[PDB]
Amino acid sequence: EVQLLESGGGLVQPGGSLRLSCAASGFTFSSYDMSWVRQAPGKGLEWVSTISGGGSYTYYQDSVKGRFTISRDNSKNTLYLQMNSLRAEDTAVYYCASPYYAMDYWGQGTTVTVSSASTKGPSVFPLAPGTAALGCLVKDYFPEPVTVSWNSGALTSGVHTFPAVLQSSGLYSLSSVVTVPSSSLGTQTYICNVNHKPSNTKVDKKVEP
Amino acid sequence: DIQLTQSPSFLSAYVGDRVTITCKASQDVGTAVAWYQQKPGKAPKLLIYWASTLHTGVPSRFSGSGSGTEFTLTISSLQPEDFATYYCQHYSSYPWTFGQGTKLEIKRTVAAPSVFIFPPSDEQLKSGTASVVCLLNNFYPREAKVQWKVDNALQSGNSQESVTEQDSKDSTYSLSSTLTLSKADYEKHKVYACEVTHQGLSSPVTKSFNRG
Amino acid sequence: PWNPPTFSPALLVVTEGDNATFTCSFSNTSESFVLNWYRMSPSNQTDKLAAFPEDRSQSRFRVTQLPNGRDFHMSVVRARRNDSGTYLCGAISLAPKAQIKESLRAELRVTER
Missing domain, CATH: 2.60.40.10 (Immunoglobulins)
Structure with missing residues (x-):
């Protein structure tokens, strides 16, 4: 069974940083591309980044270039997304995925919220x-x-x-x-x-x- | 770089119907096109790739066609589990892009909304703010327009809307529009009205109250 | 640009029950590729036998990457007389551009023992 499991999403202030991870099982991790795809509240899917099996090739959506870095640890079957200089519009569910031609396997998503607001009861x-x-x-x-x-x-x-x-x-x-x-x-x-x-x-x- | 535009964004159909969703690319993407299904709260699932290849474990009523710039997802006969959002994607070159999504919803007979207006509570008014709420209840289809009028003055920029998903038993929608004013501004005016337009009505319906 | 893969030998003869090994040779421009092994069906349709890396949603047809990175063994294990036919490999680059390139086709002849 191929399985992908994200972690790390939460609340961060604008300009801040957050690191997501994704743990993979059920396949030879280093043989496959890995990707991140996100979905802002109420919006559609947006591809974020892809990394090659060996890690040498990385590709980014223009709006995150210079702010996000994709990486992987093939000895630990883990994918990472380092998100720096976060912006309000980076608020989204982030899915780990694995392309083969299309993305045939997906995680469950982790929620990232970029906001200056503080805790307040209604x-x-x-x-x-x-x-x-x-x-x-x-x-x-x-x-x-x-x-x-x-x-x-x-x-x-x-x-x-x-x-x-x-x-x-x-x-x-x-x-x-x-x-x-x-x-x-x-x-x-x-x-x-x-x-x-x-x-x-x-x-x-x-x-x- | 390459844009994908789906048509329509929203499609209502009955169980048993043939459904056709199109995806237009802003330039040639060969056959490097995929289709996904997504339901609320869940990750997308792959249906079709290389624009016409049915993915393993996907029902045979799903088929894809096309090459170049025009792609189609067809559901040959719709089943209840197929009401969902569908996305096309290309992987011809980077950046990969998705279409905006097509939400496939349950068709039913036109139903006009029942409209209700709520003044702000005295409690909230003490807090320095006035929220006026207009409710459009149990209507179909989803398209509807709400305008606020205060002593006949059409409001702009001070309202927000929220809409439910199709109700599981009657397939209708409900919608709230909330007008937000300061207490001081609220007490300057007398007549608060929300004007609702919908295909099920021959003319707008206006619900109003006179403050105090 | 990257060149279409080569597929050798052009004619491979083996005895039924033995193994038959073709070599597909392919140099990619990036690390994102899938190499497919096909046999031609009746009606000029390709039947995928195996892939490297494997399709995770999916044993006599095996692909082995050799240490130089560019050569791949594509092996029929315990070949049958009815494995005789026309074979080829198809290389798919996924970056920077999705491109599909087939090799020239080779013949496998599996003889009666």
């Missing part, structure tokens, strides 16, 4: 209400993710929790909404449950007319 506000809509606004948190439930998981039908949006401040915000029968507003209580583990923020917010 503020939670009500979106107050024969169908009614209500919800919760989860604003100004960092880093991702937050989790949202309704009535501790008892309300799942009709719930929509939107993808977070990145604000110009560098903080994230999202909303979660639910539609319910208009008559239910008088016999039911609606509470959104928000958890932002990086800040130990566990919030419950009652949403009422």
